[PDB]
């Protein structure tokens, strides 16, 4: 089965672009990454950085996850990210998203 690490890359990594290039980015990426297969994932974030840079977050600032778990880490640096959020017109299987470009610190959960 797909590993949790591999699932992370598929759902959130986009090292081939520096940032979302058009309003259609979310629509295209959510579809192509198979995130809309069973239902419309309501929210999703893509990171436009090298995988190594994102993997290094696991050795940066240790913080509590939103749910209280203690294996979260916050990037020391801000990263180029794209926020994908479902639109009022979204209706499975024609999932629709609004694309929002940003530069912020990311918080990931790490395992090993």
């Amino acid at each position: 089965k797909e590993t949790a690490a591999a699932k992370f890359e598929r759902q959130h990594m986009d090292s081939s672009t520096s940032a979302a290039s058009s309003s259609n980015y979310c629509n295209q990426m959510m579809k192509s990454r198979n995130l809309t297969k069973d239902r419309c994932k309501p929210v999703n974030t893509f990171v436009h950085e090298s995988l190594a840079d994102v993997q290094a977050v696991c050795s940066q600032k240790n913080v509590a996850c939103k749910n209280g778990q203690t294996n979260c880490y916050q990037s020391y640096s801000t990263m180029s990210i794209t926020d994908c959020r479902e639109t009022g017109s979204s209706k499975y299987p024609n999932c629709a998203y609004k694309t929002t470009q940003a530069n912020k610190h990311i918080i990931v959960a790490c395992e090993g």
């Binding site: 993997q55 977050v57 939103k66 912020k104 610190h105 918080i107 395992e111």
Partner: peptide, 11 residues
């Protein structure tokens, strides 16, 4: 190795 398995939030 210790790698990211979940995206928790952007701050």
């Amino acid at each position: 190795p210790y790698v990211p398995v979940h995206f928790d939030a952007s701050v």
